[PDB]
Design a protein around this ligand. Structure first.
Ligand code: FCA
Length: 305
């Protein structure tokens, strides 16, 4: 044999490499081979399905590079008698409305974004920054629902703790990566010279990291910057550095659970026509910082660091 695909939009992120590793484990346990394909754009996405069909795969797990390709992915898979489960990014129709009929495995995005804002606030308090010279830089990808629900949950948590609404600045990024976030943050930074300390809000580690690299390029030292990412496994190189930076820590969800559990449920669907729940929300989360990242990853089975 049974072949299943595991398609991810960004193979460069440790987040997806970890889903790939745990899907392989599910394969070993249940007796199936996992075909690992990178689908960074819509065209590679449709061509990879064709490719899956030529290898005899019976279904695939996918994290789409664009939620709007949902209809087409479903259409091509139905054509090849393949089942599909989405992992992390939900499929939406042309109008941006959720395609509720494709089983989805994903993190509790709002809750994790809210924890990000609660932890930003906490560290800010511990540093004693004066709120009057502080501000939040929120790097958003609003067209991606999962991303939007994390950055909105984070801004909402900050506003709820008392961070002044008018000191929250949003800036859209063109790409969910360091270069995109960098660009975005750099453009906001020169517009606010009055700010002496920044909170950086981003849906994932790469976005917060681009934001931190920009603050360093504008003269901010690490004590005046607080950024907390989301993914965990993606921030290990940052947290491993000799010196501390404005990247304080990351919220470690469960990519191991997403890789193994979406592969297992696919397998059960394809091999026993056992229908997966439509929605699996994983609430797992732990704050990893320079002080505990090695222990927390080893405790989750993601050894090395
Ligand atoms: C949970 C995942 O959500 C999206 O797909 C992000 O782009 C990934 O980096 C990861 O944070």
């Amino acid at each position: 044999n049974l072949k299943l695909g595991f398609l991810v939009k960004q193979p460069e992120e440790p987040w997806f490499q970890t889903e790939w590793k745990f899907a392989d484990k599910a394969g070993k346990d249940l007796g199936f081979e996992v075909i690992k394909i990178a689908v960074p754009d819509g065209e590679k996405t449709l061509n990879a399905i064709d490719s899956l069909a030529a290898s005899g795969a019976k279904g695939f797990v996918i994290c789409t590079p664009d939620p709007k390709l949902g209809s087409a992915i479903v259409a091509k898979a139905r054509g090849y008698d393949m089942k599909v489960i989405a992992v992390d990014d939900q499929f939406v129709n042309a109008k941006g409305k959720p395609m509720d009929t494709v089983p989805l495995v994903m993190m509790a995005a709002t809750k994790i974004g809210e924890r990000q804002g609660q932890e930003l606030y906490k560290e800010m308090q511990k540093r004693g920054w004066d709120v009057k010279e502080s501000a939040v830089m929120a790097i958003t990808a609003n067209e991606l629902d999962t991303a939007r629900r994390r950055t909105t949950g984070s801004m909402d948590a900050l506003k709820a703790a008392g961070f002044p609404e008018k000191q929250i600045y949003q800036v859209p990024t063109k790409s969910n990566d360091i270069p995109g976030a960098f660009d975005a943050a750099n453009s906001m930074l020169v517009q606010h010279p009055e700010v002496k300390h920044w909170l950086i809000v981003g849906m994932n580690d790469s976005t917060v990291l681009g934001g931190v690299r920009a603050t360093e390029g504008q003269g901010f030292k690490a004590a005046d910057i607080i950024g907390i990412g989301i993914n965990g496994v993606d921030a290990v190189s940052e947290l491993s550095k000799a010196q501390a930076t404005g990247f304080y820590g990351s919220l470690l969800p469960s990519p191991d659970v997403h890789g193994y559990k979406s592969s297992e449920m696919l397998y059960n669907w394809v091999a026993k026509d056992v229908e997966p729940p439509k929605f699996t929300e994983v609430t797992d989360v732990v704050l990893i910082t320079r002080d505990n990242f090695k222990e927390e990853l080893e405790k989750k089975g993601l050894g090395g660091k």
